Structure 1
Amino acid sequence: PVIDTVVNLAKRRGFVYPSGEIYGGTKSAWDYGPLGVELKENIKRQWWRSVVTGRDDVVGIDSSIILPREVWVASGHVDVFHDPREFNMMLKTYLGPIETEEGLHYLRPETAQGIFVNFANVVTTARKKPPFGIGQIGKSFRNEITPGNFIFRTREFEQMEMEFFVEPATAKEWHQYWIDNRLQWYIDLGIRRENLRLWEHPKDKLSHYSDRTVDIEYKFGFMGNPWGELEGVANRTDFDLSTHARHSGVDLSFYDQINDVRYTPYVIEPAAGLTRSFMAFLIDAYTEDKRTVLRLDPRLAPVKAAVLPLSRHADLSPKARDLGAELRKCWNIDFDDAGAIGRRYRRQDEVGTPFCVTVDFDSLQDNAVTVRERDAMTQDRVAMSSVADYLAVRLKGS
């Protein structure tokens, strides 16, 4: 089972820790350790660049976890978000002094509703016109009945969701665009294409408001069926703005000044999972070749380079430490002088570090270092003054 092996590596090296481990934990709750917080941040950076700020037609928001309760009546979650005896899967809390119906709030089960209710605000302040999107990354909460499979299905998780508002007659081509774009995003960041597939929902598996839904599925390797949903890309017609306009009383239609027409945009929704993606990138990268290597895209790898003096000899520290401080101004780096150099390469390979930089006794005469590439183990001798440039060309886009 690749999955358990990857989970064990993730714990051993501090990608993750069980939350509250010393108190026995809480079911499905995982903390991100020193390497995990950096990998998670890198995934966020790549999504935000590809979907939001790298585009001229998508803007971002960060809306609150706790919204007014009526948001979740309008969205239908109060009446429908239940799994059987029906049990509602939203987490409740109480705000203010007394516990009353007025104080009752839900923690959001998805980030998307905070986008929809801000549609008119964003049109106004960002001066946007369909086709355009609003993207968001954040925490969501669900009282999952059977959480587990590591971080695949947890009660507290993070999503990366974008709502793309379009003229209704253009929705089918924009849906296809976003299906194609989102699938390719995973492949471009290194997931092997044979471990990804698309699942076109049959008509009898569509929501009442979706004209089409396609899931990107990843071959996680679960027992039984090894595939799982990674990201859902839905054509949500005009249901979301319509329902919030009806329940709130605020017009959420769009006025097209050029063609003087008013309409309610259709929505194409790429709904991805930050913590679920983290799991897929780790599993897919895990390789046993003997070598254990985490073949992470260099833009995702948590540590970009490790500075490794050949030994603890005092003559090598000045250079090695000076080099580490220079590189640390640019990237997250590691410094390690403990034990045999070959074992130190293997320690970095195991967590995906794309380059190791070795300072040896020849470095004291030629003022150069050896740079080792993780996967092929090529070793180039590089002038000290050129190491950062050498790394930068190979880490571009991080």
Structure 2
Amino acid sequence: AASSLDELVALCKRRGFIFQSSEIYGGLQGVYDYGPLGVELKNNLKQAWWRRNVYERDDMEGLDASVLTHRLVLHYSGHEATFADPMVDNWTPPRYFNMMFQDLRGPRGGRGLLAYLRPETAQGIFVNFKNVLDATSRKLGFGIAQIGKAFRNEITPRNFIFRVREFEQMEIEYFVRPGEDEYWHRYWVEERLKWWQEMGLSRENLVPYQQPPESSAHYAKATVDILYRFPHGSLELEGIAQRTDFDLGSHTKDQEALGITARVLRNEHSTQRLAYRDPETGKWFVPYVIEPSAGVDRGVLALLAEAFTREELPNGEERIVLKLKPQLAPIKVAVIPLVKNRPEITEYAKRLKARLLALGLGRVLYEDTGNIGKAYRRHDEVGTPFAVTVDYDTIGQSKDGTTRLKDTVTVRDRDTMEQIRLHVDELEGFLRERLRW
């Protein structure tokens, strides 16, 4: 585990995980960019999440909605009226600053040409309920998963990835029948909690907090936050709320014909009825929604934070090692040529990297950087699990003349630091064993 927030910010910048967006012109404070190593880890996390909640389940439909949100969507969801914070200057009278990113479509800044950069992914889901329903012919006890970008017009962007203006989320909207709501809520909480550990976070660092009714927003019958023990303090990773029929409620047509339980605004615009019908009979009703929502960047940081570890070495000095779960490492194997000038060597290495990539266990990388020592260092810092290295013996140029050593390479374990030399054909099975899911 890592001890300081800056150790991370430093590594992140130093090894190419994260960079201050627009750095060369002073930065656009509050927005960051993901480097070579960052994109990989980030994507690996998003994928593992998608595989788990969509592919592996049989009640989940996927989605990808746009960032440009029509003014109305955000009126009827309440944001226009409440997504704000209390602000002032130096002392003027106090007033709420609505934190949404607004931008005007086309020609003129007229009130009717205003649109928003969605501040959360969920509304995209809600407005498409009927749509999704029609096209898939889904029955109840079902949700819609989605990953995407969101923009919060924060006032003061604090410590790193935490208080940012642009970021990404992984949200699910699980539609449920009014009666069964309380069950599904605890079901999802165990599930998400469980997932995070499988990804590599320790139970000791996870904290399932249940919000007291003072904190619960009006339509939220209950909600639990999963916090992670970061170096600088506990920060929220994911939130599993229970929103009754508020969301579907606020956007649907024929509001008073469908017995809506949460208080909604009169909707004089919606063209479709977002409700479900046929509880064996013919009743229309608005489903209740359970909603797990995680923040991609937070997750990426949690993983780094957890993995980060400093080890003392027998000679006296230390080393930084990202102990990331293998399947999630930005790089799985690094193939390194002992000498940089030799062509039969580089050409072999490259031929080998490809053979390994073909196993389909994750990114294999051909490394041509000078100094076999620097390489090992660079890799432990970015958490890659294995390093295979190629030398003259591997080729067949043994100074003694035998070829008993042709096609064998040394593979160095990231964690144990143990190096063993094995023949290539065994190397495959070795890797399957250790890298498969």
Q: TM-score, normalised by structure 2?
A: 0.87
- Could you tell which deviates more after superposition, 304-313 or 31-40? 304-313
**Partner residue, 1:303:** 331
> Which amino acid in structure 2 is aligned with residue 163 of structure 1?
E
Question: What SS does the corresponding residue of 1:79 show, helix, strand or coil?
Answer: helix
Instruction: Answer with 1 or 2: which has the greater Rg.
Output: 2
The reply to whether residue 348 of structure 1 matches residue 358 of structure 2 is: no
**Partner residue, 1:23:** 25
Match for residue 416 of structure 2 among 360, 364, 376: 376
- Could you tell which deviates more after superposition, 230-239 or 258-267? 258-267
Match for residue 349 of structure 2 among 290, 300, 320: 320
Could you list the per-position Cα deviations for residues 166-189 of structure 1 after superposition, in whole angstroms to 9, with x for gaps in the alignment?
112111111111111111111111
2: CA distance, partners of 1:116 / 1:393: 43
> Which amino acid in structure 2 is aligned with residue 307 of structure 1?
V
Match for residue 208 of structure 1 among 191, 205, 218: 218
Residue correspondence of structure 1 range 73-88 to structure 2 within 5 A: 73-84=75-86, 85-88=95-98
The reply to whether residue 159 of structure 1 matches residue 169 of structure 2 is: yes
**Partner residue, 2:307:** 285
- CA drift at 1:344: 1.6
1: CA distance, partners of 2:127 / 2:109: 26
Could you list the per-position Cα deviations for residues 235-265 of structure 1 after superposition, in whole angstroms to 9, with x for gaps in the alignment?
1111111111142253211113645443211
- Could you tell which deviates more after superposition, 247-256 or 74-83? 247-256
- Could you tell which deviates more after superposition, 383-392 or 93-102? 383-392
- Could you tell which deviates more after superposition, 248-257 or 174-183? 248-257
**Partner residue, 1:233:** 240
Confirm or deny: 8 A CA contact 1:110 1:141 kept in the other structure.
yes
- Could you tell which deviates more after superposition, 66-75 or 388-397? 388-397
> Percent of pairs identical after alignment?
50
Structure 2's unaligned 5+ residue stretches are 87-94, 256-266, 312-317, 396-404
> Which amino acid in structure 1 is aligned with residue 274 of structure 2?
L
Alpha-carbon RMSD across the aligned residues, in angstroms, is 1.6
- CA drift at 1:316: 2.5
Confirm or deny: 8 A CA contact 1:152 1:279 kept in the other structure.
no
- Could you tell which deviates more after superposition, 320-329 or 45-54? 320-329
> Which amino acid in structure 2 is aligned with residue 374 of structure 1?
R
Question: What SS does the corresponding residue of 1:214 show, helix, strand or coil?
Answer: strand
Could you list the per-position Cα deviations for residues 48-81 of structure 1 after superposition, in whole angstroms to 9, with x for gaps in the alignment?
1112222111111000101211000010000001
> Which amino acid in structure 1 is aligned with residue 305 of structure 2?
I
Could you list the per-position Cα deviations for residues 263-289 of structure 1 after superposition, in whole angstroms to 9, with x for gaps in the alignment?
211111001001111111111111012
Residue correspondence of structure 1 range 26-105 to structure 2 within 5 A: 26-84=28-86, 85-105=95-115
**Aligned positions, number:** 394
2: CA distance, partners of 1:137 / 1:217: 20
> Which amino acid in structure 2 is aligned with residue 34 of structure 1?
P
Could you list the per-position Cα deviations for residues 350-369 of structure 1 after superposition, in whole angstroms to 9, with x for gaps in the alignment?
00101111113332333121
2: CA distance, partners of 1:312 / 1:153: 44
Confirm or deny: 8 A CA contact 2:53 2:145 kept in the other structure.
yes
**Partner residue, 1:367:** 407
Confirm or deny: 8 A CA contact 1:2 1:283 kept in the other structure.
no
Q: TM-score, normalised by structure 1?
A: 0.95
1: CA distance, partners of 2:163 / 2:59: 32
Confirm or deny: 8 A CA contact 1:324 1:333 kept in the other structure.
yes
- Could you tell which deviates more after superposition, 381-390 or 161-170? 381-390
